[model samples]
Each structure stands twice: as C-alpha cells, then as structure tokens.
Target chain A: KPKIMISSLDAERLEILLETLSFPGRDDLEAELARAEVVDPEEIPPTVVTMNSTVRFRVESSAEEFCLTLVYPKDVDTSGEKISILAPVGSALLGLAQGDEIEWPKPGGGVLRVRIVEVTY
Target chain B: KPKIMISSLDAERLEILLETLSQNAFPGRDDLEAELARAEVVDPEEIPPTVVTMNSTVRFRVESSAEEFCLTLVYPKDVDTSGEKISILAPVGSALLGLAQGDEIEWPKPGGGVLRVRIVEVTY
Candidate 1:
C-alpha cells in the first residue's frame, strides 16, 4: 500500500481535535507544545524497529485491527519504513501498548477506538 | 546530572530560532504547520520511559560525516536508558528529521556550527 503523508493543516486539525475532544491532561498551549516536541511528526528509528528491549501491543477499532509499533526514534529509518512521532497517526499511537484501548477522532468526523494488541523492542 | 527538558516557551523560542537561523525550506507558514504536524510534541511511551521536567540551554550544529550525516546536537539523552522519542537530540529528534528528502544539513554560527544533520525520509 502507498503511504499517506500528512499536511501541516492536518496537524492543526489534530490539535483542534484534541482540544475539541477534550482529551484529559491536554489543555495548556505550552503543554501542547511540549507534547508536540516529544511526539514529533517525523520518523524516528526507535519507533519502528525490534531492538534489544521490547514491548508489544494490539490496536482495535470498531471493525478491524491496527497493529501498533513502539520504538525509540533512533531505532527508525526515515529512508525506508515510515512511521514518525510527528504524524497524526503517530501522535495517536504514542504511549500506548498491548490491550490498551482508546477512542481517537478521525479527520472528517468519526471515532476510532483502538486497542493495543502487541509491542516489541 | 539532572536531565533538562525543553521549556514550553523554549519550544516557542526554538520556533523563533529557525527564523533567526535562516533555516531553509522553513519560510512558509503552511509549511511550518506541516512541519509541526509531522513533528509533533508529546511524551509518548515511545520517546521517554518516564516524564522529564527540567530546563537547560545548549547550542550545537549540523555536520556531514561518512555517507550519512551528523549534527552537533545540544540536547542529548542517555540513549541506553531514557526511552525518549523526542529528546532534543533523539531520532525524530527535532521536527527537522523528515523536513525534506535526503537533505544533509548544518546550522552555522559565528565561531562554528551548532547542529549537524542528514535527511533520511518521511513514511507513514
């Protein structure tokens, strides 16, 4: 499958989203910026590879299963596989792992409830 | 040593930074937003194992090494222990990671350079 890259407006849309959706502990602008820096949209090596240390997770929506990858940014290779912490999807995926489930807001208007199925380092 | 975190204003200050540094491909507002989105700011379990709270000021530069590139980074984390995805110097380190395709970069100063970099790629 071809990859879908996100636009900057897409990023703001996401920011607006979290604000509108009222995700807990996500209110301050400064905090938001801090979060942005930590959860950058670019691809990092750590988020994509199977390293020495590992964790696993499973992601589930109402219908299908979305496999989650959690690694250090350094572990990821930007030239090859692409899953950065900055993308909206990447933002949604951060800090989560196996069996943990939460509802994420889709762009147009809908909810995506994902369950962390597995993770490995 | 106490670990230092980028302050919120520091984040904003960094935003002001690119403007001052004359960083290329960083003039457009839309592009900035896109960059911001692509370079999110958060403490995903992916970046830091635990939350970090402190502040520090360090400056570095981007340089080119062998085939790959390297940066004279200022904010580095203990790679072996800290599970930080966004340590100022971690991969996807700054929102600068996937800015362009394979664009090796460096930010210079009066005395010398501050940060060194190499563009890898941007994927899903």
Candidate 2:
C-alpha cells in the first residue's frame, strides 16, 4: 500500500472534526488518518493538495473535468463548486500531490480513476 | 522524558512502581523508566488528553500485531482473567503508559510482538 502523509495541524483539527461529526464514513476516515505519517505544516510538500487548496482534477472514465476548492463542512455553501472533507472524493485527494490519482466513484455505478492535474492555494 | 508530558498523579504513582516493578528483567522495563525520567509533570486535572494512565481505556495500533486494539489498561492489582484488561506490567501495557494523544512509540517487546505503538484515542 502507498504510504500517506498528513499535516500536523490538519491532523489535530480533523481529529476533533471526526469526533464531533457523526457520519457513517467517519470510521474509514479515522482509519485513514490513524495510519498517516503526520508531519509539521511547514514540512508538507508544496505540490501536495492540502486543505483549502483549489484542485483541478479529471475523472478518467467519465472524461469529466472539475475545478473545486477542498474545504471543511463549514466552508461549503448551498451552491458553489467545493468538496467537503467528508466526501469520499475529497478524502481521497486530500493528501495527494499533483499528478497523483485515486479510485473514485463511477457515474453509473462502479469505480473510476480520478487524477489531480493541478493545485493552488 | 519525551516531548510529551504526563500528569503529576500518574508520574507520582508510576514513579514508585517502576522502581520496584520488574518484568522478569524484560528490557522494556528500563525503557518505561526512561520515559518517566524525563517526562514533564503537570497537575492531574490539567492532563490534556489525560495521558494513557492506569484504568484509562485507549485505542492504539501495534504494527507488529497487524491489528488495532482497544484495551482498558489496568494495574497489576486490577487484573483478572480477560484479554481486554492489559496489565501495566506487560510490555504492551508499559508501551502504552505515559503516552499522550497521537504519540507514536516504537519499543521492543518480548518476541518483538510490538514494533510500533500509535495512540489513536484515550478515554478516562
């Protein structure tokens, strides 16, 4: 399995988030973070997609392109293009670097690959 | 002492015990003692995250075991016939003692059953 890294600030903040919010996907995310190699925020690689990064990604199977900012549940609005940390796609891309890819939900049913094209703070 | 600290109550209690307790001469006994030797001491009530002390239920992953465990760490006097109640005298229990939240420890255990110890949660 590919090892994952998480920023320390994000790690502490999200631990509180996971404990405060009640959601089914909480366990998997908790499991995700538990295994992460947490490092200082300054140590995070510049290319890595971090919290509040605006990501440009593409779903290979659907040939779909999306531009969105990764945000906490609070930063999201009733209508704009943003991904919540609780969202599966959001969690998958949270710690990935530019050009990294993850298996994401397919349009009809199964799974597809979503690759990050770019990231901006 | 680690960059992490322990409660004064925990420090006081474990300090006395570590001096007398010996795990059949297991090397981790000294390791536990070293952890206590330099740990910062704070008021028991100010123990943020409470530290992993006796009677504290904790969640951790022992990498060598390849599985996660939720153990209610008990003092030797409190031990009964249950796998869930881990005695602080054991290597795993000693490995957990004095840990602050999110601490990752890699200490040798008997037969090397514990390679990594990462604290996930602590509930008093």
Candidate 3:
C-alpha cells in the first residue's frame, strides 16, 4: 500500500471543520491550532499510539478492496500488494477508526467509498 | 499549508516501524492487512472528514523559524489569503500531519524543518 501525510494546514482545516467559521468552535479551533506544534513530520512516536499497524477496509461505494498500513517512519516497502496513501485514496483512509467509512477522491477523477473492516491498535 | 495525499502502501509501511521485521509483532501485521477494506477514499462525510479550512505553521528546532501554508481540494481562493486546494504540486498542508516537528520532507524542492501545529479543538 502507498502512504502519505496530510499537509499540516490541511490537517488544521480538518480540525476546524464543522458549521460556521467566524464563530468556529473554540476547542476545534484550538485543536487545529495546536496541531501545528505537537505532531512533527519527523520524530513521530515509536509505534506507541494505535497508528503503528494495519487494518482492513471495505469499499462501500466502489466495492474495491485494499489494506492500509501505518509502518515506521522509514520502514515502508511498496513492491507487492496494492499499497498507496498519498493518492487521494491513501490520504482519506489514515487515522480512521474501525467501521469508519470514507468517500475519497481519485487522481484521474471521481470518488470511491471505503470502510474500516478491522484495526489492530 | 498545502495539502497532499500518500499512497495506500506507504500508510501500511507506517504501521510497521519498530526494530526488526518478520519478528515484528503479530498485531502490527494484522492491523496493516485489516486497513484494506475499511477506510475508503470516497464517500468522505460532511466537511469531507475535515479536509477543509486553513491554519498557521511554526518551523522546527532545525533553527529555522518560518510560517508555512497549504490549501484545500476546493473552496480555496489564493487571491484573498492563499487558499489552494489540490495544488497537486505545492507542499505543506494537511498532507503533512501525523509528522513530528522539524522533519525535513522531500518533493516540492526539498523543504526545511517540518512545522508543528494542531488540529480542530474548539468543540472539546
């Protein structure tokens, strides 16, 4: 599976997502604002959090199948298996909980559906 | 910051970054394999699962202190305040979350220290 990280700003945007902007939720705004400090592109945790592992996903919309892995900061191998993350499909699946469904966009165009089958961590 | 997505395979690799492979924990492998059918790319819910809005960037301890930015996939208007979604060629954005501060990333001209920031926390 291919892997990629969300841009810091994009993640921030996600944090602030909801209804209304001028009166955005204080906690939500702070969470998005704080992400700019705690999480780093380098020196991520040592597989401590529930992110260092793989999980199953069921594509509800397209009915496609694939696996997602959250390997070490530098232990990713993409020879076999339909590994991908940077691609819209990849980014949409990261950090999702079990039973979570995601409608992701495609590179060529369009979108696909994916659901968390199982997660180990 | 600009936003970008990673291939699925790369996320799998992230689930197995310890000391040695093969000898890695069984839970790790299971977790990696399980992600296949769960998290779908399409059908992302309201607010597109948080792929909206913008924020600030503080460079890491690499001794470099600069603010960075990344935009969205849609509704980004650079004319007013640098809103760019799916630039597909820009760097720094939601695509860089889950990363530690000060990490140097490739692509888009090998940038400097990865800034540290937080996500939505107004709701509590």
Ranking by TM-score: 2, 3, 1
DockQ of 3: 0.02
- The TM-score of chain B in candidate 1 is 0.25
Superposed model 2: Cα runs more than 4 Å off: A61-64, A106-112, B1-124
lDDT of 1 by residue, A50-113 (tens): 2222333223423344333333344443221223333223433443334545443321112334
Q: Tens-digit lDDT track for model 2 on B4-39?
A: 466777778776666554323321344556667777
Model 3, which residues run further than 4 Å from truth?
Answer: A1-49, A80-95, B1-124
If scored against the real structure, what TM-score would every candidate get? 0.24, 0.43, 0.29
CA-lDDT, candidates in order: 0.33, 0.60, 0.33
List runs of model 1 lying over 4 Å from the truth.
A1-63, A71-82, A89-95, B1-124
Compute the DockQ of candidate 2: 0.01
- Candidate 3 scores a C-alpha RMSD against the true structure in Å of 18.4
How accurate locally is residue B7 in candidate 3, as Cα lDDT from 0 to 100? Answer: 34
Winning candidate number (DockQ): 3
Report the CAPRI category for model 3. Answer: incorrect
Model 1 error, position A7 (Å): 32
Interface RMSD of 1: 16.9
Q: Which candidate is the best by lDDT?
A: 2
